[PDB]
Amino acid sequence: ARMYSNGKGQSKSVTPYNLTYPTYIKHSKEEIVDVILNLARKGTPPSQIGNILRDNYGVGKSFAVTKTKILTLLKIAGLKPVIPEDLNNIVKKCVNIKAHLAKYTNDKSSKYQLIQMQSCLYRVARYYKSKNELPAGWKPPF
Amino acid sequence: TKKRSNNGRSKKNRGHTRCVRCEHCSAMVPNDKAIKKFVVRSVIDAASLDDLKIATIYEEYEVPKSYYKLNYCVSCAVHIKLVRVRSRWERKIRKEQRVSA
Amino acid sequence: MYGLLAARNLKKNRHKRRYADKDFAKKARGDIYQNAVGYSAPHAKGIVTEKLGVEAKQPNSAIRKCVRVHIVRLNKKVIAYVPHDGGLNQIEINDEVIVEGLGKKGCRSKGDIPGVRFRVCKVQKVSLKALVTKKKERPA
């Protein structure tokens, strides 16, 4: 089940059985690889890179053509971010809640949501600072 | 021992409900438990409609009705005989009552 | 607590549970040496100081014959019961008597006698059964 609440949803998307090569498409390998690195330098998250490749350029799951994963390609090109993108999105939501509570101090429901959010941050931090993906003395922006 | 499967009330999937006040004694009772009664009563009694037909100035007249929903606590409903004690197999039968006049 | 490497947790839990047993608790945490006959001794010597009688509990109707004994080993004074038909007549004030338990798990009242916890066994070094049935005589 869900980690912070009583949810038991089941909405996911199916991974294919085999992957082949997308011969119906209208670009070369080298063009697709160029499209990714452009979208990266403009500052898009890698989950959004995937959405665009599927929706506009017509490639499912973005790996059948490249034999390599999106984040690994960005490390080969040297475009790696300073913080992993998951930990980064958790710090953003915390900041937002603290900015709301700063002006609407009375909101007990928002107070409740903040302590849940903050717990999730440190649980994620401890993962990354074991795999050597963050400096040992990293601390939140707060 | 537990006498009724529904604890004598219609609350499910909720914590708490609004209270209402008994018509006969003003006691507080939860809305989902209170005994309810509907009334639709003519302003004019049946024993006067034959005089109304000669009293009115209009070519035809429709008598105005008055509408009410009444609420009762258990003690009052039993005492006023809106409901009665029933046998262990009868307790389970559920049927809508008539609107009063 | 049922894991393969859980022995330490399991042991500490199960030890703590046993204090719910009255038997284990008294031995561990009560005063087990307060009594004239019990954990301490099977029999007790003492001197007779007063003769006494007590009513039986309902629904019975009787006067039971009892004796006030000063116990040499503790300097407490206790009540004891005198068993046999004419038994009270075999005892004088200032006699020495040996005293015995009634046979319950803890020191508890037996039958219809309220609040008495011991009985007389011997008077002046001789068996009370022999005295009452006139098989032997007082030392004099």
Binding site: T15, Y17 | - | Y2, G3, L4
Partner: protein, 128 residues
Amino acid sequence: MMDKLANLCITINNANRAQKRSVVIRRISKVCRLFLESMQKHGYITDIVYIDDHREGKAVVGLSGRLNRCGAICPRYDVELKDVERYRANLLPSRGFGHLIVTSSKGLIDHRECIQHNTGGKILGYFY
């Protein structure tokens, strides 16, 4: 998550009680395969197919009329060859038939093979 070897047992026990002849079992591990293959050697189950779905794994099996019951033991106790008969007498209905399965350096073996090979191991499960 449930233990995979426990899940296997409850799935076949319930279906047998409901008088079905075949079932699909939804999460499979290496020792689950070896357990089923043991029940086939002794004629408790008849036919086995394995589905390679890339999501864990699943099996489809045909039950015989000979199977009364099976079960897993948790945790998996270590036993000397001196100990196994104690567990045999606790789990099985009769001295004449049924199998207690033990994992060893020589694979899964039954309580008779333990005497033949002269080896203890870890207790895994039983069927009769």
